[PDB]
Amino acid sequence: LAFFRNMYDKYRDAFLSHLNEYSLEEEIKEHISKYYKLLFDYNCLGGKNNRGILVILIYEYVKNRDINSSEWEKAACLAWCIEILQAAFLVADDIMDKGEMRRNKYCWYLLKDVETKNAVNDVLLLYNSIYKLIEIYLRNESCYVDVIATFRDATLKTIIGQHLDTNIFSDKYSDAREIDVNNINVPEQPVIDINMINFGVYKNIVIHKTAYYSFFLPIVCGMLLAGNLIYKKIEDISMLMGEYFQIHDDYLDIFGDSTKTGKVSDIQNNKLTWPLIKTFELCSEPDKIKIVKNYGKNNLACVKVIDSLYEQYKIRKHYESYEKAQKAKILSAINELHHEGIEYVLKYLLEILFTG
Amino acid sequence: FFRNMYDKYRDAFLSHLNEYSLEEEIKEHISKYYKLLFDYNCLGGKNNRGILVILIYEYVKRDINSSEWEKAACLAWCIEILQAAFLVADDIMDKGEMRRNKYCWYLLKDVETKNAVNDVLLLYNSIYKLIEIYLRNESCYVDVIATFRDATLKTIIGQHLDTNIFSDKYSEIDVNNINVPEQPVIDINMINFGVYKNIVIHKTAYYSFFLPIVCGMLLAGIDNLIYKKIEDISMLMGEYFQIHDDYLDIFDSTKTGKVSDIQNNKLTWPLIKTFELCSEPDKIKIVKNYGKNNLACVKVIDSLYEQYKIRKHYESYEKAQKAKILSAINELHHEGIEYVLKYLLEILFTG
Numbered sequence: 096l097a098f099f100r101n102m103y104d105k106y107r108d109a110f111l112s113h114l115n116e117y118s119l120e121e122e123i124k125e126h127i128s129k130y131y132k133l134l135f136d137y138n139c140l141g142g143k144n145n146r147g148i149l150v151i152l153i154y155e156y157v158k159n160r161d162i163n164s165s166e167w168e169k170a171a172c173l174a175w176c177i178e179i180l181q182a183a184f185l186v187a188d189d190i191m192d193k194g195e196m197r198r199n200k201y202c203w204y205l206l207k208d209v210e211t212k213n214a215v216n217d218v219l220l221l222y223n224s225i226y227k228l229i230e231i232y233l234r235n236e237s238c239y240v241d242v243i244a245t246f247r248d249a250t251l252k253t254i255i256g257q258h259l260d261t262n263i264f265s266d267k268y269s270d271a272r273e274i275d276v277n278n279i280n281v282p283e284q285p286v287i288d289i290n291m292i293n294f295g296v297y298k299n300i301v302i303h304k305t306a307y308y309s310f311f312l313p314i315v316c317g318m319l320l321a322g323n324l325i326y327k328k329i330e331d332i333s334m335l336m337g338e339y340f341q342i343h344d345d346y347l348d349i350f351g352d353s354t355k356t357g358k359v360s361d362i363q364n365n366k367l368t369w370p371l372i373k374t375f376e377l378c379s380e381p382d383k384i385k386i387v388k389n390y391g392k393n394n395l396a397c398v399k400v401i402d403s404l405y406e407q408y409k410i411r412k413h414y415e416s417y418e419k420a421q422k423a424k425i426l427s428a429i430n431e432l433h434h435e436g437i438e439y440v441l442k443y444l445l446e447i448l449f450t451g
Numbered sequence: 452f453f454r455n456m457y458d459k460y461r462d463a464f465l466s467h468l469n470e471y472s473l474e475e476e477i478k479e480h481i482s483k484y485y486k487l488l489f490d491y492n493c494l495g496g497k498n499n500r501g502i503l504v505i506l507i508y509e510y511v512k513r514d515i516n517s518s519e520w521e522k523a524a525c526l527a528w529c530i531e532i533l534q535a536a537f538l539v540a541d542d543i544m545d546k547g548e549m550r551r552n553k554y555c556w557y558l559l560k561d562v563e564t565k566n567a568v569n570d571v572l573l574l575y576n577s578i579y580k581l582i583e584i585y586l587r588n589e590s591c592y593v594d595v596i597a598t599f600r601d602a603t604l605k606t607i608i609g610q611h612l613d614t615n616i617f618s619d620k621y622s623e624i625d626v627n628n629i630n631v632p633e634q635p636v637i638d639i640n641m642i643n644f645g646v647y648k649n650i651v652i653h654k655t656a657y658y659s660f661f662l663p664i665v666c667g668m669l670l671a672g673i674d675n676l677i678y679k680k681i682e683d684i685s686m687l688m689g690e691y692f693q694i695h696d697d698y699l700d701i702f703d704s705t706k707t708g709k710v711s712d713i714q715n716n717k718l719t720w721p722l723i724k725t726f727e728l729c730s731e732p733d734k735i736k737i738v739k740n741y742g743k744n745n746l747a748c749v750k751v752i753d754s755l756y757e758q759y760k761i762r763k764h765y766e767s768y769e770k771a772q773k774a775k776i777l778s779a780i781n782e783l784h785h786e787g788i789e790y791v792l793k794y795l796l797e798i799l800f801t802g
C-alpha cells in the first residue's frame with residue numbers, strides 16, 4: 096500500500112536504466128531519459144491504484160505464509176506493471192475518445208510538446224516496458240511464462256472490447272456491405288443503431304473492455320506468483336465486477352463531478368452506455384425518436400436533450416437500484432469461492448472500488 | 452511456401468478471437484474487420500524481412516521437415532505482422548497519404564485514427580499469440596519472444612528520435628501548454644551523420660535485419676559470439692537501407708508505393724550531405740525552406756539537391772557501403788549465413 100507506492104521509482108528507474116544502456120550519443124541519452132521519466136510520472140501516478148493494490152493483497156492473502164523482501168520486490172513489480180498497463184490504456188483511450196482531462200490534468204496527447212504522433216508511440220513504449228520489467232524481476236521464476244501470457248491474453252481481450260466500444264453503432268456494423276478501402280472522406284454523422292441497444296451486447300463489450308485487465312489479470316498475477324479449477328470461478332467473479340465497475344463509470348461520465356472524477360463525452364462519442372440502454376427500454380416512442388435524432392452529435396444542444404431525458408426518466412435513481420442488486424450478486428458469488436483469504440480480499444476490494 | 456502459409460497463421464489468430472465469449476453476430480463483425488486489417492496491411496510488401504527468416508533458418512544447418520517449416524514460417528509472418536503494425540503507426544505519426552500503392556489504413560472513413568491506434572496494438576499483440584501457438588514447446592521460445600520485445604523497444608526509441616530530433620524540447624516539457632503549437636523548424640546542431648546513424652540504427656536496423664536473422668538462428672539451435680557479429684552487420688545494413696530509402700523519397704511513387712520528407716521536416720541523408728557540401732548562403736536557404744508545406748519551398752530544396760549532385764554522392768556512398776558490408780560479411784566464418792546476407796544485399800531494393 097504505502098509500500099507499493101514507495102517502490103514506484105525503483106521500477107521506473109530500472110526501465111529507464113535499460114534505455115540508458117543503448118548505443119547513443121550522451122546528449123541524446125539525456126534527452127531520452129528526461130522525456131521518458133515524464134512519460135511515466137505524468138501517466139502512471141495519480142490513480143486510485145486499485146488494480147496494483149489488488150495484486151499486492153491477493154499475493155499476500157492467497158495463503159498466510161512468510162514473505163521476504165526479495166519476494167515482495169517481485170510482487171510490487173507485477174503491481175506496478177498493471178499500473179503501467181492502465182497508463183498505456185488511458186493515453187490510448189484519450190486519443191481514441193478525444194479526451195480533454197484525465198486525473199485532473201490535460202491529457203498527455205494534448206500537450207503541444209507531445210501531440211498525437213508522440214502519444215501513439217508512447218502507448219507502445221509503456222506497453223512494452225511492462226514486459227521488460229517482468230523480465231528484469233521474474234525471468235527466473237517458474238511462473239514467468241504464465242505471467243506474461245496472462246498480461247498478453249488480458250490485453251487482447253481489452254483491445255477487442257475497445258474495438259467493440261468504438262464501433263458498435265458504426266456504418267460497418269449497421270450495414271454488415273464491406274469496408275470501402277477507396278473512401279477517405281469524412282464519414283457522415285454517426286448515429287445509434289437501435290438493434291444494438293440491449294444489455295446482452297453491452298455485457299459483451301464491457302466484460303472485454305474492463306473485466307479482464309482490471310480484475311482477472313491482477314488476481315491471476317497475485318495467485319500465479321504465490322505458487323486448477325478455481326481460476327474458472329475467479330474468472331466468473333471478475334466478469335461480474337467488471338460490469339459493476341463499468342456501469343458505475345458510465346454513471347460518472349454523465350452524473351459525476353469532473354472536479355472529482357478528474358475527467359470531462361460518451362453521448363458526443365456515440366457510445367453504448369448503461370444510461371442509454373436503461374432509458375431506451377423505459378421511454379416513450381416519441382422519446383426514442385428524440386434519442387435517435389440527438390445521440391452521438393457534437394452539438395451541445397443535442398447533448399442537453401439526451402441529458403434532459405436522463406433526468407426526466409430518473410436514470411440516477413435506476414443506477415442506485417442496479418448498484419444494490421449487483422453488489423449483492425457479487426458478494427453472493429464470492430461466498431461460493433470456498434477460499435477464505437481470496438474472499439477476504441475481494442470483499443475489501445468491493446467496499447473500496449469507487450474511492451480506492 | 453512462405454507465401455502460401457499466410458492464410459493459416461492469419462486464421463490461427465482469428466480463430467483465437469473466435470473462441471471469445473461473445474454473441475454470434477458480434478463474432479462475425481469482429482471476424483470480418485480483423486480479416487481486412489491483416490489482409491490490407493500485411494500483404495503487398497516485398498516481404499524482405501520474412502524471407503530473411505526463412506533463408507537464414509534453411510542455411511544455418513540438414514533436412515527440414517514440414518513441422519519445422521511451420522515454425523520458421525510462423526516467425527517470418529510474425530515479422531511481416533510487426534512491419535504491418537509499424538507501418539500503420541508510422542503513417543498515423545507522419546500523416547502518410549499512400550503506403551504500398553494504396554490509401555493508408557488510418558485514412559479510411561470506416562477506420563480513422565481512433566481505430567488505427569487500436570489496430571496497431573492488435574497487430575503487435577497477435578505476434579505473441581502466434582508465437583505461443585506454434586513455438587510454446589520449443590526450447591528457444593523465451594529467447595525468441597525477448598528478441599521481438601527488445602528489437603521493438605529499440606525501434607520505438609529510434610522512432611521517438613526521428614519524430615523529435617528537430618523539436619524545441621531537443622534544443623523541459625511544458626505540461627501546461629495545450630494551446631501554442633510548435634512550428635516545425637530545422638535545428639542545425641542535429642544535422643550530422645553521427646546523430647543520423649543513432650536514429651537510423653535504432654529505427655530500422657534492429658527489427659529489419661537483426662531480429663529476422665536472430666529468429667532463424669535461434670530456431671535453428673544456435674550465447675554464441677556470432678550474435679555480436681550479426682548485430683554489427685545489421686547496423687551497417689540498416690544504415691545502407693535507410694539511406695537508400697531517403698534517396699528514393701526525393702529521386703516515383705509508382706515504384707515506391709508511397710508519396711514527403713522535405714515538407715515533413717525529416718532528418719535525412721540528402722539533407723545532411725547537402726549541408727556538409729553547401730555554401731553559407733545555401734544553408735540559410737535550406738533553413739528558410741525546409742519543413743514547409745509549400746510547393747515553392749519544396750522546389751527550392753529539390754533544386755539544391757540537384758545543384759549539389761546528391762544523386763552522384765549517393766551512387767558513391769552506395770559503392771563504399773556495399774564494400775564495407777561485404778567485408779564484414781566475410782569475417783563471419785559461416786558459409787550459410789554469409790551466402791544469405793550476400794543474397795539479401797542483391798535483393799534489398801527489389802525484394
Ligand SMILES: CCCCCCCCCCOc1cccc(COc2ccc([N+](=O)[O-])cc2C(=O)O)c1
Nearest residue numbers: 142143144184185187188253254257304344569572
Ligand atoms: C491500447 C489499446 C487497448 C484499448 C485502449 C484503451 C482501453 C480502454 C479501457 C481502459 O480505459 C480506461 C482508462 C482509464 C480509466 C478507466 C476507467 O475508470 C478508471 C479506473 C481507474 C483509474 N484510475 O484510478 O485513475 C481511473 C479511472 C478513471 O475514471 O479515470 C478506463
Ligand SMILES: CCCCCCCCCCOc1cccc(COc2ccc([N+](=O)[O-])cc2C(=O)O)c1
Nearest residue numbers: 215216219496497498537538540541606607610654
Ligand atoms: C509506435 C510503434 C513503434 C514504432 C513506430 C513505427 C516505427 C517506424 C519504423 C518503420 O517505419 C517503416 C514502416 C514501413 C516501411 C518502412 C521502410 O521501407 C520499407 C521496407 C519494407 C517494405 N515492404 O516491402 O513494404 C516497405 C517499405 C516501404 O517503403 O513501404 C519503414
